[PDB]
Amino acid sequence: VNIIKKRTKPFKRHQSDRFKRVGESWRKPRGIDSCVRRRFRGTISMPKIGYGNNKKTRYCMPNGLKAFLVRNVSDVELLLMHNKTYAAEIAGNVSARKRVEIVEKARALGVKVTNAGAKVRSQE
Amino acid sequence: FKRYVEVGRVVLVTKGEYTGKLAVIVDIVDHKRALIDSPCSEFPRQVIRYGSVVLTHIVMKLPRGARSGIVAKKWKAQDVCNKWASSAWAKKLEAKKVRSQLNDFDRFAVMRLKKQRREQVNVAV
Amino acid sequence: KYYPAYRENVPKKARKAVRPTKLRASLAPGTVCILLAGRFRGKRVVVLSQLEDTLVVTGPYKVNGVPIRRVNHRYVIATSAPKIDVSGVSVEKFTKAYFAKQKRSGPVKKDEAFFAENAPKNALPAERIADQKAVDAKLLPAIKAIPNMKEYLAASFALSNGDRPHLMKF
Amino acid sequence: SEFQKVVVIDAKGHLLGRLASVVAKQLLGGQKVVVVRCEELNISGHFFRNKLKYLAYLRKAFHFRAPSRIFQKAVRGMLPHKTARGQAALEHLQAVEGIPPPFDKQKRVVVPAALRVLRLKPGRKYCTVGRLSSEVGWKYNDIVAKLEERRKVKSAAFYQAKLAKQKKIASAKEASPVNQKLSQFGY
Amino acid sequence: AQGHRLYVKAKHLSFQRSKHVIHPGTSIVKIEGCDSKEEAQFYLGKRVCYVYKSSKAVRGSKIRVIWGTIARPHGNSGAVRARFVHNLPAKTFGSSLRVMLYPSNI
RNA sequence: CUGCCGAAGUUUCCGGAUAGCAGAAACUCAGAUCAGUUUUAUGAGUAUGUAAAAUGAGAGUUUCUAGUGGGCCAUUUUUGGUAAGCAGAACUGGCGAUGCGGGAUGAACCGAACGUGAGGUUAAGGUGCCGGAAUGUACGCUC
RNA sequence: GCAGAUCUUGGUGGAAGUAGC
RNA sequence: GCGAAACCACAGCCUGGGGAACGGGCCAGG
RNA sequence: GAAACGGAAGUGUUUUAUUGACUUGUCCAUGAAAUUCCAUGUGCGGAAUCGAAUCCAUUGCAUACGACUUUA
Q1: D63 Cβ within 7 A of any nucleic strand H atom
Q2: CA of A28 to C1' of F1 (A)
Q3: For C54, which of A25, B101, C70, D57 could close a Cys bridge (C-beta 3.0–4.6 Å)?
Q4: For chain E, domain boundaries
Q5: Cβ partners under 8 Å of residue E78, min gap 6
Q6: Which residues form a coiled coil (chain B)?
Q7: Which domain holds residue C162?
Q8: Distance of alpha carbon D112 from the chain centroid
Q9: Are A72 and A102 in contact (CB under 8 A)?
Q10: Sheet with D93-95, side-by-side order of all strands
């Protein structure tokens, strides 16, 4: 069950490129006369449930693992039985001291870390 | 003029399943259809359109509406076979068919002989 | 470490059986054949025997310099040139293990892997040349008897202007 | 069937629309097309027919009279000239009156799908582009209709020299026994 | 130099398209010498390539190739439908393609 | 933000009570019923109606509870017409809440009604070029 | 939970170094 | 030298057609 | 090294004189491989230079200004 994405482009809000005051976060058009709501030809696509991805491969990174947010060594040890299904992702606000402790622990557990090189240097 | 649509004139079929088969006109159904027949068993007597045949220069005397067997007798009597073949038109067609049948080894041989032929290059000074 | 630690999604029993490859009727042993790809593209070589899928093929090494090789039957054109006598030469020594690339053993130390002080080369052994010479000796009289065939195998096939492969016959 | 880098077409006896459509499709196919003798193109219809068609065109734009400019206009209308693909295809077409020196020594082909003798019913009036151009503004008809004989005379002399030269090898062909010793291959 | 070219010349005409909708995933290829849909049956499944050159000498070479295969004939005149590993660029309309003889069934 | 359901756009009296359309709840009910359907024959006047056959679907409800109370394109039947067009009724459906292929382009014409994709095959239209597809076959008219 | 309210407050543009003094 | 304000959805060459203006914005052309 | 021909946009058609080679014309002897089944001078930025043009002595011949024409 390799990972298949029905779509890789994001859904940008209509007229978000024309106007800087209009953000690109998707907003469902409400105008009846608007051609985007009527889904004419050549217009931008809209989020539909048909675009949803496979339940088995949902939330899975391109390497087949699911990102599990980790904030300390207690969170890494949780993935002892799920190292083939989940990858550890250290939070952004975890200091470089705790990041080191997390990374050594994850290495013994056989757990992939998504951002294991952040905020640290190497010295062999 | 040398080719007139006539009773008894030999034609060559160029379209249809009988392409490349000689035949002789036996009757004129209309200006667009002619009744032809050939002595060989592979060519049944049939009505063909004038756009599917080319007209040859051989005219052999037949009675109007002659039957298939009598057409063969006249064809053998007037030796149309080996008379059409004598013309360079049939020799060119036969050579084209033979050349199409050559395989890869035969094509290599032809290149060797034609190189042996070309190296002749003897011209008087 | 042995008891499975996960769900162990064991594959279902797949009902697929291995059956012998049905090669073309024109790829008989001994027929002259044109190589289509590889470093020896365009060469004409003699089919010694058929392996399971590939054809154990070689041109006489004294003719076109194509050694005992394997060729996939899809990347070859079986010409209609007169067949060569190949029943004489035994071909039982040509199996997939005979042509298989040497497995990686790599006996080294972590002192010469650094500095690249290994220089590992596996140039073709003498028995391979001996086998090639034996095949050449048993094949050359067969190609010498029939005319215009020795240098035909030396030539390289190519397409010229106006050549239509869908119409040309080989 | 097959393509060349440059294809030279002798437009003598070719219908304007039939040749232009074939040329336009070849231009879009990625080929460089040269059309010579553009003044010898034919158009179905009598002299007065296309006369009023061109006279109405004059009533309408940059009115061009030269026969090549007529043919160039016909080909252009059959191209997507509003896009870069159509413009690029147009630049590969070289239409001229007569056969200039770079092209009179090159082989010229014809388009059977555009030939008048194979498309127009016998006994149908036709208007040559060169003659039609001569009265609507073109003024170089006489000088190009005079130079063609010079080209024809030189070309005819070349053909005679080539034919005389060929006779030697032709005689030498049957002279060599190997020509018929292995002529069983059809050659 | 006529001892090479094991392939057959071809031209990239367009993508599969209606009057106003184009489908770049499948391309229309005109194999030269093939003049009908019955002769297009010989080239079905054959490998076709687009060969071009780019400025960078990446891989220590100046030439790069897009591979593809011939799927089915298109129309009556011998054009074929080819699917390439990467969709052929629209700039290659009228460009040249090479149709090999492998996978060969001859 | 996504998903699901989904109108009416008008009878009747007369701003509404309605009804009707669309949902919720409380039911019972296949050994039973229902139907923009066709029938059998005779009743009445080919149509029309009848009780009981074919086909399809399980159906009947009771209560309350949102929204609407127009038009347009017109077709057809049709009345008056009146220089002639045209106007007046009903009927019929569609648009109105509907994107898509075609129609050179197109709000009402021909096809077809929509989750995200791969492959195949078509409809209406088409296959000289623009433009994907026979400068196809056969028989005729016209310059 | 904002794109609209000839929205409120603030900031900043093209007009324009123009009309002009 | 000093120095505005009104105004500002956005670009901006024409001939025809797009039925509800179609036009500037579509279609076919120059 | 060449001479002729080629004007329509000749820019190429020959004639060669030789000087060297491959000569597939043909017959032999060597070498091909573990790629052991497809993947394939030119441009810029600087200078020392040589000419030319403009401004320039200019001029009204031109003239809102540009820009133009003559002469140092």
Answers
A1: no
A2: 8
A3: C70
A4: 1-106
A5: E30, E31, E34, E35, E36, E37, E39, E40
A6: none
A7: 1-170
A8: 11
A9: yes
A10: D6-10, D32-36, D93-95
